[PDB]
Symmetry: D2
Subunit: 224 residues, 4 copies
């Protein structure tokens, strides 16, 4: 899109400001990343602007860019099409954990050419003081299949069952739904591609002040 | 014991990305669980049912039984306060989150409430302004630890079509100071609430009656 | 107006594939909302908390306010009856389904309840016999149509560890004949219930009190 | 070494209290995740969409990647077996519970599946036979302990109106003997399934293809 950029306008770089609180404990992180929007790969570095995180940095995954996700056959995903034409979308995600904790993420983006700027507000509450989030006991996130559905032409809901492994070997579960609101209607040729799934893998290296994150995503309508 | 007499609210956010922003003042009786609030839009008319802001639009006015302070009142009394994070999941897949923060000046409360609602169908009763009232409701309160309250309720509106419009609601309250042992010992606690809302396109006049109970037998 | 005075129950099924089967009789007071029931296992010791069978173990004892019949009593009264399909979804992922069917012999009720539960952790409070009591509870009754009711409640037990053990419960009632209009219009309706269970591994002695209410103010 | 070649099903229960009973026979290919089944009503015409019996109507035909026995196959191979308790919660409030029990005789499976469904609106697509197909589906499998599998999937039908009809499904499997440790170390496991159904009101002809996968990349 754009008189001096004739191809699709897909992301090459991003930056994130993520902030909010977990059990009223305030956090704020900023950082920059890159990725490959033809392969569904992204990576991001973050650093606290407020000293050490008093909870598992893994509770920020998957809060920490579907603009890097292509659809099959080199097609644009609806996320990519909304960045391509400047119209955009918003996200409102809610995670509901097996221990009654809730985590809401509110994601907003602006775009400058192939660079994305994210402002994500995240609020989590009701994490038990001896549970794995507050004791920093999460070790990894399981690989995950999300299903994409379209309640109308301007909305997507994605849905997934999200599980971490913990230092004890036990899993820690939540139900996640993400409501996407698009400023412009999603193209009919995307809407007809149902059902659609996305396989995702994440990695995270962290200290108490810094995060180094990676995600691979692959959309698929079949395996067989 | 310093209980509230007056309040003000700045409530803002969006419903299906449509932004709103309202400000106003109210009063209430913390010995009887009554409050009333007027709000006015700082933009234009709301582009959705004003009823979707109920019960977003002050447990500081709720006494506990036999004249005791509720934990919400105790937290105001000593200034330590609490936060609210509320999530409503509707039958049609919509989600509404409310994030409530307060400051206190003597017997005056100032509320800053952020509300984000998404996934309301364009032909549903929220977006077509077809909600007519909110059913009276019983909330259940438990205390999972000395700093945390979880309340839960099934929230239903009546609509012009006669079909009720339902959501399941959970509210997580986070307290800066521990809640009194003697409060913690009485679980669960229930609260019976009635609401009223009169509105124009730009102004809302809201009332709420709330009464806590352990038993009705 | 032929209200219940006695009942009997055969309740059977399995918990995590462990079969159980109990039988026994009871009495109650359908003007007071009281019932008691004594059950004995027909398959020796229960291999799980007997409290997981509460509230599986008779809304025909529930009057509505001012001496009115509840819809459940009315359906006994005229013989037409109703069926129940209840699902409880627990915080630890376990699911318990109950299927309740009744026949009537004058003022006597005969129940056949099938109950299947799975997914209870081996180290959770049901399988370790660590439930200590069931919290008092308010249920909400709604009517999707003239021959169905849905009831909903947040069910919690206390346990020996101090941590409550929670589930969301929904009960779908299917009535053979339409529920009277004068009942349908009393919405919303709530019921306050209290239960007691004294037990061994083979014998359960249960009591329940229930009181319908439209308001508390 | 022993995998199924044939199966028979007796599936029975009720939808909105309307009783149904079907019986029939099928085959499949357990090296490839394929099965087909024919069913005929033993009572009258089905009083609701036959598609609501999909996926009630055999993971013993599912291999795991690389010519592995699934744990479902291993349990048939050694005769120890497993039971299934499935709950579907639909977007309109309906609930459908399935309870599946099997016996084996050589390479033949005999299933006895009890299905109870309630809460389907009179005007909804199940009761108006408005379901047209089931979307292709990915299920997630996890193993909470060595005797239990939980599977989970979002199940959607297409309908004559064009609006999909959605439910959240969970299935709890209880195994009589422990699942092998090598199987337990690989989770989550996913399964891609495709179904077909041709039907009248009295007869169903069903096909399913299933492929387990740990990755797609």
């Amino acid at each position: 899109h754009h008189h001096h950029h004739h191809g699709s306008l897909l992301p090459a770089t991003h930056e994130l400001h993520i902030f909010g609180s977990i059990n009223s404990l305030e956090f704020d992180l900023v950082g920059r990343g890159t990725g490959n929007p033809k392969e569904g790969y992204e990576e991001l570095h973050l650093k606290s602007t407020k000293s050490a995180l008093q909870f598992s940095p893994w509770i920020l995954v998957p809060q920490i860019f579907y603009q890097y996700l292509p659809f099959p056959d080199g097609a644009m995903s609806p996320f990519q099409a909304a960045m391509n034409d400047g119209s955009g979308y918003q996200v409102h995600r809610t995670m509901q954990f097996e221990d009654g904790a809730t985590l809401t993420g509110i994601y907003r983006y602006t775009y400058e050419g192939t660079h994305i700027k994210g402002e994500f507000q995240v609020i989590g509450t009701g994490f038990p003081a001896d549970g794995p989030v507050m004791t920093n006991s999460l070790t990894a996130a399981d690989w995950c299949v999300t299903k994409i559905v379209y309640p109308n032409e301007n909305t997507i809901i994605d849905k997934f069952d999200w599980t971490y492994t913990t230092t004890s070997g036990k899993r820690y579960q939540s139900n996640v739904r993400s409501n996407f609101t698009f400023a412009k209607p999603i193209a009919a040729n995307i809407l007809q591609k149902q059902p659609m799934f996305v396989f995702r893998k994440t990695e995270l290296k962290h200290s108490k002040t810094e995060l180094n994150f990676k995600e691979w995503q692959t959309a698929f309508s079949d395996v067989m």
